[PDB]
Symmetry: C2
């Protein structure tokens, strides 16, 4: 059944809405939410997580850093997985 | 880093990678498993679920149907999650 997938969506919503609630209106991820996320990321994983900070910042900041859209966050989920070179190109 | 975020995306991409080929974990989604999902989702043609199947098929199977690419699944993740609007923004 869809249940496992729906559970995964459930978790994703679970995470995202904590940010999006903080004025991420129209289902967005705003500058505020970004700086909070960045701060939270900037902790005890200061190589991998920082490479992820750079990748996040770059991937999301197609100028729209002010108000990045949920679909771009989804695309970033894509971009993370896409590090599986060849299989997902790179 | 190890986090609710990481766990969530991990579960999502993992369960996707399984679902893609319940037969044998393909990295892209096969018509077989799509058709399994559709049948399960129908159950007896649970109306809302059929509208859901129209949405699913239309959004997901962008010509690539025999086998469907992770990118399409990702955008489908977005499109699906969008329905959770209230919870999505929170």
């Amino acid at each position: 059944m869809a249940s496992p997938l729906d559970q995964a969506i459930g978790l994703l919503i679970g995470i995202f809405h904590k940010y999006s609630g903080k004025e991420g209106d129209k289902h967005t991820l705003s500058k505020k939410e970004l700086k909070e996320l960045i701060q939270k990321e900037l902790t005890i994983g200061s190589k991998l997580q920082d490479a992820e900070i750079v990748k996040l910042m770059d991937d999301l900041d197609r100028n729209k850093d002010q108000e990045v859209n949920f679909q771009e966050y989804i695309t970033f989920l894509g971009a993370l997985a896409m590090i599986y070179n060849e299989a997902l190109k790179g």
